[PDB]
Design an enzyme around this catalytic site. Structure first.
Site: not given
Ligand code: NI
Ligand code: NI
Ligand code: NI
Ligand code: NI
Length: 571
Positions: A367, A400
């Site tokens: 993430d 991300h």
């Molecule tokens: Ni990811």
């Molecule tokens: Ni997210």
């Protein structure tokens, strides 16, 4: 001019070593290095020292290997690790900037710093911890921690030790030695009730594999002086490997690859994650809340004053990676995050914390690499602002967003400086997001002196949504709506951003009075990126922004703007 603010980061010292960091100026065009002196004697250069001690450094050097024509902003090192010292001994230290022409700056104001006494050492193997292939070591490891006197170092030696949730206490170091793997139990019972995220959060989350969590209290200073160190691995046992289980990275090193799952797929993809979601659904949660709340994160430290994290590798979390909630004075130095692509496996979360520092980290995350959070809605201010973060000399690989502020902006995210980092394959360099009813926002955020290649999505995205009592919202809405202002993007280069969305994307809702303001963009080159899309923005300027190899016809697309300016000319 002399380098400023030479310092030892919180707890970044022991009986034989001391880490030093210092500010680099905004303009480093002439500075190529820094030399570090102890009692006016040369210890060495920052570049060379990082080659030795930083896991990010070989990746960072390698990033420039194919950069003929000197397109990429050249980052400078701002840290130096001093080893081979003696216990309980003062040392004086200064630093000088090394210039292009070979000359040196005036010395910085000196600092004196003192190594600690050699610690009581507690080996978990002396409590019956064993790497035998399926003893659960929780009790052994917890017994060793419980036996700690103030200042103890607890050692996990070479070997794989399966363990449930552990509970740390003040004034100790957990050292994960070379070859050590702390492995998460896959049994949900090994992770009892842990915490609620915010005071107004209603669903209790399980304990993480490593915890500093007082059952009642989240206030900074509930714990103090917690250190987790060493070159061993913490593996959360969250997920199965992806179909391609392992890759060879840009340095020819192997990275693990974790399956990218979702709530409806966790029964096929999860290990601990699967078992914990199954247990939560059978306890009565729907699948969405079970997935969203009932997977153990890798590490949760809450209410700690003075935290030092160094050296260790993070793999395979069942949920988030490293969580700091209501901490003061946190340093993460040379951590290696290998958690791609574990669903919600962010690298480091900072939540309503103050005075935080990340350097020499390698990020490959499922993430966000580094995420900033500060609560949601009217009650947010029950808690400290997320205030004071300094992120430098890191290598961001996949993730991300290198620097994400936050979605949860309620008590304010502020005074954030991310400089002298490199990003390669990361989705986004700087991400700022919120909605109206969350309140607060982020301000005084500087992203500068960073170099980026092959971004997967976009360079910088600032987004602000409305709504209203149109809301399926769990918190009470904020009286003053969420805003972003005072953002500085300076001396940044990006070569290639492979997404189809806008390179620089700024978006709000001016109809509903939601705009960004005071965005200052200076001296940025973007090659092989898509055009910008900038909305809802006032009192801002873009100077010396050059687009080359544009994936479109014109770089600048503006709408709903007031008192903004390119460079230098009204829009
Ligand atoms: Ni990811
Ligand atoms: Ni997210
Ligand atoms: Ni060198
Ligand atoms: Ni594994």
């Amino acid at each position: 001019d002399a380098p400023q603010q030479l310092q030892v980061p919180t707890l970044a010292y022991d009986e034989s070593s001391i880490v030093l960091v210092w500010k680099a100026p905004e303009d480093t065009r002439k500075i190529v290095d820094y030399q570090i002196f102890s009692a006016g004697k040369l210890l060495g250069k920052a570049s060379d020292n990082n080659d030795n001690f930083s896991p990010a450094k070989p990746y960072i050097d390698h990033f420039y290997v194919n950069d003929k024509d000197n397109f990429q902003h050249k980052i400078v090192m701002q840290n130096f690790t001093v080893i081979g010292l003696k216990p309980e001994t003062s040392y004086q230290f200064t630093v000088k900037a090394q210039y292009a022409d070979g000359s040196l700056s005036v010395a910085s104001k000196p600092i004196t710093a003192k190594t600690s006494a050699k610690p009581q050492i507690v080996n978990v193997r002396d409590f019956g911890a064993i790497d035998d292939g399926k003893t659960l070591n929780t009790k052994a490891i917890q017994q060793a921690i419980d036996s700690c006197k103030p200042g103890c170092r607890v050692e996990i030696p070479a070997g794989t030790y399966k363990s449930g949730a552990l509970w740390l206490k003040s004034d100790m170091t957990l050292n994960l030695q070379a070859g050590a793997i702390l492995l998460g139990s896959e049994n949900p019972d090994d992770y009892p009730a842990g915490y609620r995220l915010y005071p107004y959060s209603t669903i209790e989350r399980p304990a993480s594999l490593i915890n500093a969590i007082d059952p009642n209290n989240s206030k900074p200073g509930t714990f103090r002086n917690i250190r987790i160190t060493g070159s061993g691995v913490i593996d959360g046992n969250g997920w199965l490997r992806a179909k391609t289980a392992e890759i060879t990275d840009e340095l020819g090193r192997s990275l693990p690859q974790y399956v990218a799952s979702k709530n409806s797929k966790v029964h096929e993809d999860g290990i601990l994650a699967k078992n914990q979601v199954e247990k939560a659904v059978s306890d009565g949660m729907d699948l969405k809340n079970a997935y969203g709340q009932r997977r153990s994160s890798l590490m949760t430290l809450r209410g700690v004053e003075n935290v030092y994290l160094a050296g260790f590798t993070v793999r395979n979390p069942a949920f988030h990676g490293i969580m700091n909630l209501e901490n003061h004075n946190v340093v993460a130095n040379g951590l290696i995050h290998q958690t791609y692509d574990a669903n919600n496996g962010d690298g480091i979360e900072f939540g309503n914390s103050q005075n935080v520092m990340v350097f020499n980290n390698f990020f490959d995350t499922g993430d966000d690499c580094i995420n900033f959070a500060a609560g949601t809605g009217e009650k947010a201010q029950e808690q400290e602002p997320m205030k004071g973060a300094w992120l430098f000399n890191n290598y961001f690989r996949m993730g991300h967003g290198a620097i994400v502020t936050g979605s949860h902006t309620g008590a304010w995210i502020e005074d954030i400086l991310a400089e002298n980092n490199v990003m390669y394959l990361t989705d986004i360099g700087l991400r700022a997001k919120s909605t109206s009813t969350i309140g607060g926002g982020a301000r005084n955020v500087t992203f500068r002196n960073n170099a980026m290649r092959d971004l997967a999505k976009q360079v910088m995205v600032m987004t602000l949504d409305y709504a209203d009592s149109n809301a399926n919202i769990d918190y009470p809405p904020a009286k003053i709506p969420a805003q972003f202002y005072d953002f500085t993007l300076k001396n940044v280069t990006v070569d290639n951003s492979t997404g189809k969305n806008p390179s620089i994307e700024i978006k709000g809702d001016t109809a509903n009075k939601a705009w960004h303001r005071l965005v200052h963009v200076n001296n940025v080159q973007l090659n092989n990126v898509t055009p910008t899309a900038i909305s809802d923005l006032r009192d801002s300027e873009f100077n010396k922004v050059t687009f080359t190899e544009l994936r479109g016809d014109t770089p600048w697309h503006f709408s709903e703007v007031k008192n903004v300016k390119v460079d230098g000319k009204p829009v």
